């Protein structure tokens, strides 16, 4: 069935004749970056519908994400690679594309890359340190909302623990008395949570307000957006500056390391030892936040931590210089030195 | 003295210079376009480039005397590692404006440099991509003739196999510069290549297991054929 190329999404019968096609309405480089990744764009929905009103209930996509979001959409979707659609597209590019089909795989080949690839910048490690520094200040604002949305409603706090699930209530409703049983369902609330909140509008004490309500909602508006940004920029720009360091311990602890040392160079200049303790001095060693170090008994940690610092060092050095992605080997090497620690 | 002749292989040339020794060289497909700090040369009007093997791991395979070098001219090839462009600039020269290359190293920081090159060297697609996740570039490649894998992954084996099952025409080939410890940092090299040639050839027709000493410790450019 469904596959993709530089021209559009194609649709194929069990035997490989062309069912329906539809060309990319928006820049290919904008669309592929989504479909390829597994996200559904307007052209992949419109073709999903017209394919249906042609009398189809079966769908097969090449990326298991596409076909998982395809069925949380309604359409029954199986996921098989390489599906006879792409096996039909690639084996016969010229059939569909034309003679210069290659040129076309390049034109758009390049375009998309120049997208995904950030322009060279003297100090992006510094841009990260910042955005990391900010994500720390927003941590405080989020902590601050807590007692607030609550002055008027103390109950919620215990009910919704997860900030993003929580800031849902404020942003959209505000006032205790803005509660619907029909907007209680929507938002993602369970049946239990459809009574734990219909018990809200009419149960518990808390000093209602009308002007305050629209002060706090203005607070949640500005809390989400600097947050995301920061988290999402800190990631997609940890890819230019220290992809090795990144894929080692996650872009955050990564960014925390760069920051903690105050730049990339600085980190690189650090021996395993200086890195095994970079983070703290009762805190002691930022890198101990590593999954495998934490889940372990203190008597074994000192050992693993050593091994981490050795690989983070390398990650830095290369990252500093070239940024050739050698994480895998090192993640491997490391996973193999730890099993011996047991 | 500075003399330049044809090699065993198509699009491959051998040169001998003032020091009376021989060095590989490829027909640079783009005059005055120098990648990787090259040593180039010029005979009766052509700019043959020095395929220095310290820099490329194929230099080695070839200078160490490779037998089957499926990379002819015209032959489109998938390439898992295209990085700075070095060990892979040559393979554009060999292939020719009739051949093709889809190259795939995933660290943008790096790739970012090969992006200029492809302006005149319009014979490579600089795909920022990942070759552990093949599907995710099902739209910027096409069935190739030769998969060439150079990746510091530790599963080089199933990576080659899987890119293969996706984009490699029957009768196509495949070349994987395998590091030993890259696959296992605890298992003896000799014993590893026996396990690679094993797993690898459970889907392939193993053509040739070629060592790379003394250009690279425990490196070994295999050459599989897809029956």
UniProtKB/TrEMBL annotation, chain A:
GO terms for cellular component: box C/D methylation guide snoRNP complex. It holds the Pfam family Nop. Residues 241-342 form the Nop domain. SMART domains: NOSIC. GO terms for molecular function: snoRNA binding. InterPro entries: Helix_hairpin_bin_sf (IPR029012), Nop56/Nop58 (IPR045056), Nop5_56-rel_N (IPR048896), Nop5_N_sf (IPR047099), Nop_C (IPR042239), Nop_dom (IPR002687), Nop_dom_sf (IPR036070), NOSIC (IPR012976). It comes from the Archaea. Belongs to the NOP5/NOP56 family. This is NOP5/NOP56 related protein. It comes from Pyrococcus furiosus (strain ATCC 43587 / DSM 3638 / JCM 8422 / Vc1).
């Amino acid at each position: 069935f469904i596959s993709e190329n530089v021209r559009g999404i194609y649709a194929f019968d069990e035997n490989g004749n062309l069912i329906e096609k539809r060309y990319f309405t928006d820049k290919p480089e904008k669309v592929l970056d989504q479909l390829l990744k597994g996200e559904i764009t307007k052209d992949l929905e419109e073709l999903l519908n017209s394919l249906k009103e042609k009398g189809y209930d079966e769908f097969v996509f090449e990326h298991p994400e596409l076909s998982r979001r395809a069925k949380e959409l309604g359409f029954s979707a199986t996921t098989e690679f390489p599906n006879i659609a792409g096996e039909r597209l690639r084996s016969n590019p010229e059939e569909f594309l034309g003679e210069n089909w290659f040129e076309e795989y390049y034109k758009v080949g390049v375009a998309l890359t120049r997208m995904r690839i950030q322009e060279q910048s003297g100090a992006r490690d510094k841009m990260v340190i910042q955005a990391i520094e900010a994500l720390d200040d927003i941590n405080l604002l989020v902590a601050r909302l807590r007692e607030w949305y609550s002055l008027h409603f103390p109950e919620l706090d215990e009910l919704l623990p997860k900030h993003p699930q929580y800031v849902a209530f404020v942003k959209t409703v505000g006032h205790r008395d803005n509660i619907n049983e029909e907007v209680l369902r929507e938002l993602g609330l369970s049946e239990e949570k459809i009574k734990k909140i219909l018990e809200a509008k009419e149960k518990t004490m808390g000093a209602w307000m009308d002007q305050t309500d629209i002060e706090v909602v203005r607070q949640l508006a500005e809390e989400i957006q600097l947050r995301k940004k920061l988290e999402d920029y800190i990631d997609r720009a940890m890819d230019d500056v220290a992809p090795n360091l990144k894929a080692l311990v996650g872009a955050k602890l990564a960014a925390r390391l760069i920051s903690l040392a105050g730049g990339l160079r600085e980190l690189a200049m650090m021996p395993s030892s200086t890195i095994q303790v970079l983070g703290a001095e009762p805190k002691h060693g930022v890198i101990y936040q590593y999954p495998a170090i934490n889940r372990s008994p203190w008597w074994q940690r000192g050992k693993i931590a050593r091994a981490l610092a050795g690989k983070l060092a390398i990650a830095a050095r290369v990252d500093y210089f070239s940024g050739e992605y050698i994480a895998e080997e090192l993640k491997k090497e490391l996973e193999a030195r730890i099993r011996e620690i047991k | 003295m500075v003399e330049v002749k044809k090699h065993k292989f198509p699009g491959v040339y051998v040169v001998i210079d003032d020091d009376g020794s021989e060095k590989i060289a490829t027909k640079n497909l783009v005059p005055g376009q120098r990648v990787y700090g090259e040593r180039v040369i010029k005979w009766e009007g052509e700019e043959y480039r020095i395929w220095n093997p310290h820099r490329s791991k194929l230099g080695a395979a070839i200078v160490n005397g490779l037998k089957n070098f499926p990379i002819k001219p015209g032959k489109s090839v998938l390439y898992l590692g295209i990085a700075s462009g070095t060990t892979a600039s040559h393979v554009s020269d060999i292939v020719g404006w009739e051949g093709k290359i889809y190259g795939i190293e995933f660290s943008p920081r790096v790739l970012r440099e090969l992006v200029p090159i492809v302006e005149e060297r319009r014979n490579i697609i600089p795909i920022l991509g990942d070759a552990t996740k093949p599907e995710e570039y099902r739209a910027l490649v096409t069935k190739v003739d030769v998969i060439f894998e150079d990746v510091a992954q530790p599963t080089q084996a199933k990576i080659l196999i899987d890119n293969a099952k996706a984009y490699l025409k029957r009768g196509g080939y495949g070349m994987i510069a395998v590091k030993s410890r890259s696959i296992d940092v605890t298992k003896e090299p000799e014993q590893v290549f026996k396990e690679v040639e094993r797993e690898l050839s459970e889907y392939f027709e193993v053509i040739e297991r070629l060592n790379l000493e003394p250009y690279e410790k425990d490196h070994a450019l295999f050459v599989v054929r897809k029956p």
